[PDB]
């Protein structure tokens, strides 16, 4: 048993949260190119037989309510869970269109004790966002 | 009994503390690379090994182009954080 059981009836959900436009409040600029990413992910995980749900330009409240709601579904016939976040960010932080959300708050809904029908199943979070303001200048090879 | 934090994988586009890069026409470097490696390899490689090829592709094939010198010629490495307890294959026998 060195591999996850992936022969449940369903591979699972793949939730894609694609935030492109931010409240002029926030000060964040438009994330041009993110719709290409969102569409590419949808097609990639479709071919992996995931039930994909694409959501666009969610406030931080809508992100918390969506992930809470998804965590209360019955995943018993699903092998796995995937969430993809495309947005501005900071270390440990993802941005809704109006303001920051702690990544911990989002992933805690899926902890083994709080989402029992995903206990023992792989939960994958893919995060396209900044984690600070350091620049990597590279080294010539 | 298992730990409540077990069986999560966090596939971050960039290393802790750093910017992450997005091409305004073709999308983020990391997502472009992740989709490409999944397309190419999901029918045969374990996911951490796919993600390692995503690391290599982002690290070697991309460098920023910017009219702002401050942000020009920069690099990126993604960051795989695995609390997984088993191998993950996107297919079944």
């Amino acid at each position: 048993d060195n591999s996850y059981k992936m022969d449940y009836p369903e591979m699972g959900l793949c939730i894609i949260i694609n935030n492109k436009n931010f409240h002029k409040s926030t000060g964040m600029t438009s994330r041009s190119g993110t719709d290409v990413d969102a569409a590419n992910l949808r097609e990639t995980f479709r071919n992996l037989k995931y039930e994909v749900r694409n959501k666009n330009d969610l406030t931080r409240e809508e992100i918390v309510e969506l992930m809470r709601d998804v965590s209360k579904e019955d995943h018993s016939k699903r092998s796995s869970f995937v969430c993809v976040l495309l947005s501005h960010g900071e270390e440990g932080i993802i941005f809704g269109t109006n303001g920051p959300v702690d990544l911990k708050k989002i992933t805690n809904f899926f902890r083994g004790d709080r989402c029992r029908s995903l206990t023992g199943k792989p939960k994958l979070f893919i995060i396209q966002a900044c984690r600070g303001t350091e620049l990597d200048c590279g080294i010539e090879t | 009994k298992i730990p409540v934090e077990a069986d999560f994988l966090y596939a971050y586009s960039t290393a802790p503390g750093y910017y992450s890069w997005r091409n305004s026409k073709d999308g983020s470097w990391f997502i472009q690379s992740l989709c490409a490696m999944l397309k190419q390899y999901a029918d045969k490689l374990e996911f951490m090994h796919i993600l390692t090829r995503v690391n290599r592709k982002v690290a070697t094939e991309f460098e920023s182009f910017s009219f702002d010198a401050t942000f020009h010629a920069k690099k990126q490495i993604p960051c795989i954080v695995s609390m997984l307890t088993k191998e993950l294959y996107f297919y079944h026998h």
Binding site: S87, G89 | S13, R22, S64, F71
Partner: peptide
């Protein structure tokens, strides 16, 4: 052009 997230 490339942009940061």
């Amino acid at each position: 052009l490339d942009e940061s997230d």
